[PDB]
Amino acid sequence: DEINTAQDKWHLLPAFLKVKGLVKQHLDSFNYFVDTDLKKIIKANQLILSDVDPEFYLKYVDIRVGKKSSSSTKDYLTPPHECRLRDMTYSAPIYVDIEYTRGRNIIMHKDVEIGRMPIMLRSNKCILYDADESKMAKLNECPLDPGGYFIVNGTEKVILVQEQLSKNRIIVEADEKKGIVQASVTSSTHERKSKTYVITKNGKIYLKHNSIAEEIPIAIVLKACGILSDLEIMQLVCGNDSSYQDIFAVNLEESSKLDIYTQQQALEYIGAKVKTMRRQKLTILQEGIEAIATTVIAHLTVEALDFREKALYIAMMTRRVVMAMYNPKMIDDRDYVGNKRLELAGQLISLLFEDLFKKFNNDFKLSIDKVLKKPNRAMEYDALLSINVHSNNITSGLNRAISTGNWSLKRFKMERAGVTHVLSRLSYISALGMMTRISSQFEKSRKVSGPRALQPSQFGMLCTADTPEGEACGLVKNLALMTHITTDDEEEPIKKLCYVLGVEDITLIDSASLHLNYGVYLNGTLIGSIRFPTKFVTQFRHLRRTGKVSEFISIYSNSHQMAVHIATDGGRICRPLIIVSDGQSRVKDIHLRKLLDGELDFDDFLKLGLVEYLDVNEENDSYIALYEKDIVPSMTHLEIEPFTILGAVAGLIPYPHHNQSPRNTYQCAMGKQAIGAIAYNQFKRIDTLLYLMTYPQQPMVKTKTIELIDYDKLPAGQNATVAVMSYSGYDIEDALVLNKSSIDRGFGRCETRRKTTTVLKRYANHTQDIIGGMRVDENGDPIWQHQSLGPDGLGEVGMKVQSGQIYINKSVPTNSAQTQYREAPVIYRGPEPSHIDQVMMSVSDNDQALIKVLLRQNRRPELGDKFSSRHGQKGVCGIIVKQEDMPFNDQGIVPDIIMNPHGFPSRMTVGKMIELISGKAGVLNGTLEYGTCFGGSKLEDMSKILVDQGFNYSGKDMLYSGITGECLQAYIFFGPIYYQKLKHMVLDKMHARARGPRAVLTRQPTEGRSRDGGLRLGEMERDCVIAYGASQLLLERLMISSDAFEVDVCDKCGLMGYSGWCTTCKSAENIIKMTIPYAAKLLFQELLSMNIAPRLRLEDIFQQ
Amino acid sequence: DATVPSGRPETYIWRYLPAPPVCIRPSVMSNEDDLTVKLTEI
Amino acid sequence: KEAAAELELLNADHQHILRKLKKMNNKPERFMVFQLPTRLPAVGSIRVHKSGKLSVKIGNVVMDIGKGAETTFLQDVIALSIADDASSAELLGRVDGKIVVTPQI
Amino acid sequence: MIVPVRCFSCGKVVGDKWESYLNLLQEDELDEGTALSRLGLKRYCCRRMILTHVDLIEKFLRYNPLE
RNA sequence: GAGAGGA
Ligand SMILES: [Zn+2]
Ligand SMILES: [Zn+2]
Q1: Which of A28, A114, A871, B39 has the fewest CB atoms found within 10 Å of its own CB?
Q2: Coiled coil: which residue ranges (chain B)?
Q3: Do A532 and C6 touch (CB under 8 A)?
Q4: Beta strand pairing status for B27-28 and A477-478?
Q5: Which residue range(s) make up the domain with D54?
Q6: A698 near A712, Cβ under 8 Å?
Q7: A331 with A181: CB under 8 angstroms?
Q8: Is A701:A978 a contact under the CB 8 Å cutoff?
Q9: Do strands A689-693 and A929-930 pair parallel, antiparallel, or not at all (unpaired)?
Q10: What secondary structure letter does DSSP report for A36?
């Protein structure tokens, strides 16, 4: 057989996902962290000193995770599922090297644990690393589980990928609302992060800062930065354009209006208004130099006698500002994807561990100084006790910060909340889509329609259909299939490579000719100017393709400002693309054959320079072909496949290129909450809330994406024989008509598993909690409340429990602050009976009893349950009708679901009709058809198969009415559609209250459903009641049925009294009893607690 | 309005704090609410 | 477009620098400044080809095809020296232009 | 988990055929369509009951707590 | 308390 490139180039994605899986940002980031940043931070804080005893120091020679000394074997870790069940924390010990001196001046070594770092699932440290279907089975781990999430306190917490603006990059925004433009740079070092704005006020360029006083003129700072000629300023900010010099001439005379300046004088002026404080006495000029040396731009530290780099950086910022001034629309959009970076779990954990390690070292040094402060007999033996004392602190802080999601830091004074999310377990696609999720840095973005739009620059980088619809509709995004997040490759070698490539350095180009040719910017800072930019770009790209440099170093050309940018920092989003030479591609139809054979695992494709990683910015310089047949002899890249523009979730949809986009978005939203198979160990798992499908079925119309994410092995749905027809009237608006006698045979049958935990804590008074129970009434036998408890006080496995029906008879001492045991049993408070199927008893690390009881409840598709259609056609079960009262074809098939035909004409889900036809044709032909974005099984072939079997070419059979027994006067769209049952079931949503618990404060009904509370009739509802002009109903609803209080108001001083006693007049003669809402009484008392007196004045209701 | 008592400019300066009833500031599970702590500090 | 203009400019710079090298054969005080890749690959010759093509070599066979640095001017640049901290700073003269070389593929 | 005993739309008893179906794919390897038709599954409801089925219980039984 | 469906 001959390989066809146009239909076999798509096989690179399986290779890409095998070598670089879907969950690779978390895994690779954490592996890089544990392999590099541990030792980096160790060598950073490698020394602790003291004011006394100069011959005493601790040297951290080396650090390892899970590796005691040589060992030759990773230390034994608790398996992840054991940690999940026992509510422990999955972690590995950290062993460091020790170098502690002695009074005899002897250096000795040790290897001691310093803490326990949590281990990300399926990382280089986890035991699941390289486990194949037998080790995973023996460890109760699902082979198809994504990984990348931590197990802390027995909870699956995932560090979501955080998007942010690119650090150390110039972002200029023209606020025309006032005529103001700016040039701020959030330079971010490992220690400092500050914004150096360059605003434009009074047509005059300034430079604000968080460390200087107010609006320093730009000419002065340019003189202080070294460029004092006052004419090189005009040749660095305006070049030779006449229309720019007059714009910038206004602020060039502010270096002489106040007084003429020199470099020292300008430094003194900038340091005079420095708001930064000095902990040691420094001269104003000395501090001012610092204000230019490091304080102005943390990104660039000029630790030399020449500040030309920083001066030219400020000059380029001013040049950009002047360009914006002369003509707007030359600014750069902040929402542009190339201007954003993605920080994964590795970097965040690096920051947290660095903070914790520096705090630990400070505490250890303080303790060492305290112990050694004694003038005599200051022994050094057992100097490593306080380290093991404090080793609890580091691991406790790490686990707590990961679990709670509040990352408290002090070095940067940065506080971020909600970094870690509890891993979602509803379907398989839900748990996979929670991974590879991106959270916007914007808090709310109330009306700003910028960050919430779909930027075209994210084509292939982000899923252009998957986004929490609602209040985060545009803020939260998800990675696509073909997408690799970069990491910091190098910074120093690339400068030497550029200098070899033929760019004159920054200290050898005059300001006059600096704007006459392209200047190459390396990672945002000007390096030099090089003639022939095209030759330089081509040679650098060739060097990158041949493997000389890292594949993630992206070089591109900007012509609006003549520049050749080179980006090397990590966090850039990159995707693979096939390199095409003049006119033709580079796959050459024989590398595909080798790939299919088993060699060239997408890495020899990079080594041989057939494919390359393009980030968002490098795509500006490229011309990309969608298909090989469109390659004109000018394009420089080719798409591997256009259906990778959709994420893992969006791959569920069949024929997504035929639907309307909001339908695809709704499907991406509601496919996570579709009940179905979750994992292979879903029965060995005790989770808070699991929804399971009794008989899950593989979809008929598959997708090339769902084979790669293994959605055909753990599906969530069933192939319902849908008849698209208006039937029974109970399916008007999105409502469905479920078919009885199919629910009976098992269709939509589901299961709900809920865990209940109990901790038998040991109090400080040496008193435990006893689970003793099982009372007996007369003639033996257990009482009704204990009828399903068992002898040991833990509910028998397999029994049935109802309202009441204690299944954990826990008793607690009354003297916790042993005979007096107050009984505090765990009572199943449910509306329907559920069965006990698992009871696990164990202990945690601290040796305290822990009992987890799992209650299973088998649920039937009752009326009012929500079913989706994998196209955004969500609906409720309007009616359940018997089999005979249903249309039937010539063969006697009756539909399982009768979807209304009105869902289509206004939502344009033609993809659903094509799915029905393809599914019917495939099932008649006995094969699974493919509905994939931009392709899939063609309609003509499916219609040919449909007409070969004797069915109509359009899939419209002719049915017989089930209640009159005659033909339906219109042919009925009839065929299998993959319908998925969603978790929003009416059994969990029905809720009613007559009387019950009331709030302690305002004596009003509680709010939730776990507390029997009423429905809030808020401001909008009372306004609606006002509109009808219903006064007695308003009074009854908002006073009588909500909170009524009989108060005693004094007729003289309108203050409420108790028991007919005014307490102020002390007469009880003017007291009058009347009923007002308790909320009003509370308000009156709170006003009287302030210096406000709501004195109620009364008048007779009667007497005319 | 100076016609009635308490209609004086000197009644708007804190000389006596009305301590609200414990019903307004109940103790939860002890764990006193904010107002009790604030007036204890006062 | 860009490639053709770059090639024409490179040919113009080749002929211009050949003329400059021929013209500055007189040696009163004039210099010229070269930029070379570091690491010293190990000399060679600036071998001129037909139709005004210039290339250089080193002891290793390597044809660094890069000619013509910035034509920057209005910056008077002169070269001096240093002699063992004694009476020194002897003015060696000014430079006419600059050449930058680059290894090719 | 396992094959449904009865095909929801019609009622045919499709539970017994599953094993047989597997044999028709393992020994004397037919196509799925011909194997389904040879088992008497004429209506496409019974066909999609067997063809589009995941035998999850095979994977579940790898984690039995009484080995 | 704050993470996220949901209509
Ligand atoms: Zn009174
Ligand atoms: Zn059937």
Answers
A1: B39
A2: none
A3: yes
A4: unpaired
A5: 1-67
A6: yes
A7: yes
A8: yes
A9: unpaired
A10: I
Ligand that lies nearest to the alpha carbon of residue A1051, given by its number in the listed order: 1
Resolution at which this structure was determined, Å: 3.2
Q: What is the dihedral of CA A284, A285, A288, A290, to 10 degrees?
A: -110
- Cα–Cα distances (Å) from A817 to A105, A522, A764, C55, in that order, read 53, 66, 8, 92
A864: region left, alpha or beta (phi > 0 left; psi from -120 to 50 alpha): left
Copy the structure tokens of residue D46: 């019974």
Residue type, A334: R
* All residues at 6 or more sequence positions from C19 whose CB lies less than 8 Å from its CB, including other chains: none
Spatial CA neighbour of D39 closest among D56, D53, D51:
D51
What does the DSSP assignment read for A1026-1059?
HHHT-HHHHHIIIIITT--EEEEEESSS--EESS
* Half-sphere exposure (Cβ direction) of A485: Cα atoms closer than 13 Å: 30
CB contact under 8 A, A894 and D10: yes
Annotated binding residue A933: no
Count of all residues that appear for chain C in the document: 105
Look up residue A472 and give its two tokens: 């985060």
Residue whose C-alpha is closest to residue A791's, from A812, A776, A779, A801: A776
Terminal Cα distance for chain A, rounded:
105
- The identity of residue A1036, as a single letter, is E
CA of A419 and C1' of E5: distance in angstroms?
Answer: 18
- Interchain pair C102, A509: CB under 8 A: no
Angstrom CA distances, A128 to A64, A83, A137, A144, A687, stand at 19, 14, 11, 12, 21
Beta bridge partners of A217: A206
Tell me the C-alpha distance between C57 and C63, whole Å: 5
> If DSSP states are collapsed to H, E and C, what string results for A400-442?
HHHHHCCEECCCCCCEECCCEEECCCCCHHHHHHHCCEEECCC
Chain B residues whose CB is inside 8 A of the A1086 CB are 20, 24
User: Which residues from C are below 8 Å from A499, CB to CB?
Assistant: 37-38
Alpha-carbon gap, residue A93 to D29, rounded angstroms: 53
**How far A497 CA lies from chain C's nearest CA (Å)?**
9
| Nearest partner of A983 among A701, A669, A702, judged by Cα | A669
Its sign, for the CA torsion A979, A981, A986, A989, is: negative
Whole-number Å distance between alpha carbons of C77 and C90: 15
* DSSP code of residue A339: G
Domain edges within chain C: 1-105
Of the candidates A734, A792, A837, A1012, the residue annotated as catalytic is A734
Q: Are A562 and A517 in contact (CB under 8 A)?
A: yes
Helix/strand/coil for A1005: strand
Catalytic annotation present for A769: no
The Cα–Cα gap between C104 and A542 comes to 10
Token pair in block for residue A220:
């002065």
**Residue A468 CA to E1 C1' — how many Å?**
23
* Per-position DSSP letters for A613-640, written without gaps between them: EEETTGGGG--EESSGGG--TT--EE-S
Contact indicator for A923, D48 with CB cutoff of 8 Å: yes
Judge whether A261 and A269 are in contact, CB under 8 Å. Answer: yes
Cβ of A500 within 8 Å of Cβ of C38? The answer is: yes
Are A196 and A211 in contact by the 8 Å Cβ rule? The answer is no
Q: How many independent structural domains does chain D possess?
A: 1
Extract the tokens encoding A404.
């709670």
Q: How far is CA A819 from the centre of its chain?
A: 51
Judged by a CB distance cut-off of 8 A, whether residue A710 touches chain D is no
Contact A906, A900 (CB under 8 A): no
Could you give the CA distance from residue A599 to residue A1100 in angstroms, rounded to a whole number?
A: 98
**Residue A382 contacts by C-beta under 8 Å, 6 or more apart in sequence?**
none
Count CB-CB contacts under 10 A for residue A760: 17
Residue D45 assigned as binding residue: yes
Find the D6 Cα to ligand 2 centroid distance in Å. Answer: 8
A973: nearest Cα among A904, A1058, A907, A1030: A904
